[PDB]
Design a binder for this molecule. Structure first.
Ligand SMILES: *[C@@H]1O[C@H](CO)[C@@H](O[C@@H]2O[C@H](CO)[C@@H](O[C@@H]3O[C@H](CO[C@H]4O[C@H](CO[C@H]5O[C@H](CO)[C@@H](O)[C@H](O)[C@@H]5O[C@H]5O[C@H](CO)[C@@H](O)[C@H](O)[C@@H]5O)[C@@H](O)[C@H](O[C@H]5O[C@H](CO)[C@@H](O)[C@H](O)[C@@H]5O[C@H]5O[C@H](CO)[C@@H](O)[C@H](O)[C@@H]5O)[C@@H]4O)[C@@H](O)[C@H](O[C@H]4O[C@H](CO)[C@@H](O)[C@H](O)[C@@H]4O)[C@@H]3O)[C@H](O)[C@H]2NC(C)=O)[C@H](O)[C@H]1NC(C)=O
Ligand SMILES: C[C@H](CCC(=O)NCCS(=O)(=O)O)[C@H]1CC[C@H]2[C@@H]3[C@@H](O)C[C@@H]4C[C@H](O)CC[C@]4(C)[C@H]3CC[C@]12C
Ligand SMILES: [Ca+2]
Ligand code: NA
Ligand code: NA
Ligand SMILES: [Zn+2]
Ligand SMILES: [Zn+2]
Length: 781
């Protein structure tokens, strides 16, 4: 048939009839007259003086006739040129206290305006280059920058924005991927991306449709120019109440292309930024023309930043591996390695990793088995993520061999904490705040916000719902603190010293402990288990009788506190805990028989308040299994760094503990999932150790008497039997441990997922502020 009267229709027609929608050029299914009827270009996209009040001519791309406003198809500048109206950008900021929408609108619409490769620092260029974007920014709600997901590439980030999920969960783990179950590859170029099997989770357009909220088609065939896309959105916004969508999207491919060619700081970046701003200007003028400029919520959001990268900064795997033709490399600003052929039984990942580990002094990438990547990246739990991963230094590439390789000066893809990868967020409209700055946040949080903006219930996702309530004038969501599942026991003196046969040798009480050492209340255990609260002068812990060690150990170290040494006669001291059964305690004979495994302590003897109290630090209930290699890291943290942090931050409260994540899903392991124990024992081996280090944001107040907001940094250290990750680890600990720790920085939330614990349950702060605190990441950038 014809597309007459159905150009860019909001219902995709089945395989009997031809199509007239946004994507009919991509699946080459358009009616023969789609180009003629739906892609008119005559006289361009702007009204001029001589066209004002013209008789309508159906050949024109947009109209300047008296009927155009009623028909909803004026050029965006019609009112400005023909009716003496002002451009939206020339109007003062005026607070939008309530949505001002035409009658019949049931909710404020949401428009998502996405930009590809828009570096946070581009907003520096100001009104001189981007006057419309700068008005949105300063008038609405904005962050200094927004953290994308890893890898910092287009598709993983665009689908993360839409779903609230990590790539490991939504399935778009790269612009390129191989799936070994499908035995097929996915690429930006090609038809494979159109198959539904790749795309998991529930994107916003689906959440909307399932709950009765109609969505505009988010995507366009590339041959449809930007001006037509804006006019079509404006057209859809003029439909009747029963047909009009409530959510829309526009995606710009700029300024990515120019960034790749000229680099992020080229003079050539100005015009692409002007072009995007012009497009924003057309949307805002068009909205104003329709009287929807104080009705619609607009999000201006980037997918990632852009870095200086040239082909002369390329590492080649052929300089490291002898049999480089036996492997397949996903290359560039990250590396992923698998066997070239599945028939090759000789392929060995251990050999590959070893060959790629600390071989050149300036070496500009580092290899990892995926389960050993920093947990903050959340990049492992998907069969499309190859076992071998290369984290590449900012400014560099990795390639397989030299003949694989100047056509570019910019790239992206690196670690999402790198500054050049940070991107933009602006929220403008009745539901966002007025002239408000908010702290940097992660793009995984936006799905929840977009659902709140539309009155939708979010599908289960990786955001923390409530953590961005402070972006909004009005909230449909009020978060609730979860219910504790397991109540603690508080055991007294229940057992004799001589009743222990553990092979170990050595040469209000509640109220005082709790108020000094648990500043923010007891963590809640959100799963079914059996644990005991143990009180001591210097620290408090929740001891698990199932894992035979603390789930958490909590203590406070003032700026005045003194570092002592473990005296030589107590080096091998481990003491039984009379409150805890011998059958629910560790034993020292397990450690003697296990030739690879030693032990450490969660509360450090080095920071004990007296020689008397120090004895509690050696209790069997404060003991945890530690590889000798890891003890170098842990000893340096406890002996040197905790004190240094207390000094710099005016006291710190520390909560430390074990993490078990053998299946690398970022979630607390059950007993069944633990694959390693201290030899011949029931004592499970942690994959990581965490600490959460809290103090007062106002550091002139000490940590234990803080009136206002809190300040937190945390980490999740991998519990490794070597220090191969750290190329400088033969040197003194002062030259490498802290760099290791900063690489493994983490959010409190990451620790909560991995432990099934809920922190900060008793503070003077609102729960919404606390959720914000829990999503914070200290990046060291
Ligand atoms: C980040 O946030 C994520 C989302 O909350 C967390 O990921 C979730 O993790 C849980 C716990 O492991 C996991 O639960 C398992 O689910 C198994 C069933 O798997 C299939 O179905 C689910 C459910 O689909 C529906 O709901 C999801 C939200 O979860 C929604 O996005 C879907 O569109 C769909 O919606 C429809 O239903 C809901 C109601 O149920 C309606 O509300 C809605 O309107 C819709 O009608 C899917 O999510 C699964 O998807 C995975 O697999 C497909 C196919 O391969 C992939 O394409 C997809 O990307 C996704 O892959 C990821 O997860 C799997 C694990 O499922 C990984 O292996 C993979 O590598 C990816 O990471 C499937 O289609 C279920 O069998 C299993 O049950 C068993 O274990 C539990 C105990 O845990 C026991 O209770 C049971 O008795 C069983 O023995 C378990 O329940 C979710 O599947 C998973 N969801 C997603 C989207 O990943 C993630 O943990 C979190 N991360 C962190 C660090 O916090
Ligand atoms: C981003 C992607 C296309 C962008 C692009 O670079 N195109 C290349 C040039 S051209 O061919 O488009 O002209 C969009 C277009 C259609 C979308 C797909 C839809 O059709 C059908 C599916 C809808 C589901 O809710 C999600 C997955 C699903 C498969 C969509 C995934 C995202 C899809 C594939
Ligand atoms: Ca796990
Ligand atoms: Na040992
Ligand atoms: Na090393
Ligand atoms: Zn991009
Ligand atoms: Zn790009």
């Amino acid at each position: 048939g014809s597309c007459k009267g159905r150009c860019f229709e909001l219902q995709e027609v089945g395989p009997p009839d031809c199509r007239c929608d946004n994507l009919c050029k991509s699946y080459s299914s358009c009616c023969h007259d789609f180009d003629e009827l739906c892609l008119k270009t005559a006289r361009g996209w702007e009204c001029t003086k001589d066209r004002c009040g013209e008789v309508r001519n159906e050949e024109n791309a947009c109209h300047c006739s008296e009927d155009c406003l009623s028909r909803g198809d004026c050029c965006t500048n019609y009112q400005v040129v023909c009716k003496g109206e002002s451009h939206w950008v020339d109007d003062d900021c005026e607070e939008i206290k309530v949505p001002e929408c035409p009658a019949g609108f049931v909710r404020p619409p949401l428009i998502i305006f996405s930009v590809d490769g828009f570096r946070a620092s581009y907003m520096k260029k100001g009104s001189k280059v981007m006057p419309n974007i700068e008005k949105l920014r300063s008038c609405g709600t904005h962050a200094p920058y927004m953290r994308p997901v890893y890898p910092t590439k287009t598709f993983p980030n665009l689908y993360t924005l839409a779903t609230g999920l990590y790539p490991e969960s939504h399935g778009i783990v790269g612009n390129s991927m191989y799936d070994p179950v499908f035995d097929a590859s996915f690429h930006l170029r090609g038809r494979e991306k159109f198959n539904h099997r790749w795309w998991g989770g529930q994107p916003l357009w689906i959440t909307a449709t399932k709950q009765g909220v109609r969505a505009g088609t988010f995507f366009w065939s590339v041959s449809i120019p930007h001006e037509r896309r804006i006019l079509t959105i404006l057209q859809w916004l003029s439909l009747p109440d029963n047909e009009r969508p409530s959510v829309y999207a526009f995606y710009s491919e700029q300024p990515d292309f120019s960034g790749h060619k000229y680099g992020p700081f080229g003079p050539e970046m100005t015009n692409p930024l002007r072009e995007i701003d012009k497009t924003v200007g057309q949307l805002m003028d068009g909205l104003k023309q329709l009287r929807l400029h104080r009705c619609v919520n607009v999000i201006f959001v980037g997918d990632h930043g852009m870095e200086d990268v040239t082909c002369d900064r390329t590492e080649f795997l052929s300089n490291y591996l002898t049999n480089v033709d036996d492997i397949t490399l996903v290359p560039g600003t990250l590396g992923r390695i698998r066997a070239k052929s599945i028939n090759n039984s000789k392929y060995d990942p251990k050999t590959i990793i070893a060959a790629l580990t600390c071989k050149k002094p300036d070496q500009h990438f580092k290899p990892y088995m995926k389960q050993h990547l920093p947990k903050r990246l959340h990049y492992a739990n998907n069969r499309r993520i190859e076992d071998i991963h290369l984290l590449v230094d900012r400014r560099w590439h990795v390639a397989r061999k030299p003949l694989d390789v100047c056509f570019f000066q910019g790239d992206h893809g690196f670690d999402n904490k790198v500054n050049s990868m940070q991107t933009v967020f602006v929220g403008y409209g009745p539901t966002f705040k007025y002239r408000t700055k908010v702290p940097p946040f992660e793009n995984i949080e936006l799905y929840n916000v977009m659902c709140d903006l539309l009155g939708l219930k979010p599908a289960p996702n990786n955001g923390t719902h409530g953590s961005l309530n402070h972006l909004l004038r009005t909230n449909t969501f009020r978060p609730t603190m979860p219910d504790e599942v397991s109540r603690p026991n508080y055991p007294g003196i229940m057992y004799l010293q001589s009743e222990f046969d553990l092979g170990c040798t050595c040469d209000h009480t509640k109220g005082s402990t709790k108020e000094r050492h648990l500043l923010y209340g007891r963590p809640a255990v959100l799963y079914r288990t059996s644990y005991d609260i143990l009180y001591h002068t210097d620290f408090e812990s929740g001891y698990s009788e199932i894992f035979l060690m603390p789930l958490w150990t909590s203590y406070t170290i003032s700026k005045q506190a003194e570092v002592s040494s473990i005296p030589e006669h107590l080096t091998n001291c481990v003491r039984p805990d009379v409150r805890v059964s011998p059958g629910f305690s560790q034993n020292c004979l397990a450690y003697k028989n296990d030739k690879q495994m030693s032990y450490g302590f969660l509360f450090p003897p080095y920071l004990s308040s007296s020689p008397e109290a120090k004895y509690d630090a050696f209790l069997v209930t404060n003991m945890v299994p530690m590889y000798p290699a890891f003890k170098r890291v842990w000893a340096y943290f406890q002996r040197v760094l905790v004190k240094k942090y207390a000094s710099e931050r005016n006291g710190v409260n520390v909560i430390s503990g074990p993490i078990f994540d053998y299946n690398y899903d970022g979630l607390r392991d059950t007993e069944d999932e633990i694959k390693q124990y201290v030899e011949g024992s029931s004592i499970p081996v942690p994959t990581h150790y965490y600490s959460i280090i809290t103090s007062c944001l106002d550091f002139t107040q000490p940590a234990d008497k803080c009136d206002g907001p809190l300040s937190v940094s945390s980490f999740i250290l991998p519990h490794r039997p070597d220090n191969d990750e750290s190329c400088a680890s033969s040197e003194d600990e002062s030259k490498w441990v802290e760099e290791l720790m900063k690489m493994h920085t983490a959010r409190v939330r990451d620790i909560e997922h991995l432990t099934g614990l809920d922190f900060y349950r008793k503070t003077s702060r609102s729960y919404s502020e606390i959720l914000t605190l829990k999503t914070y990441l200290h990046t060291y950038e």
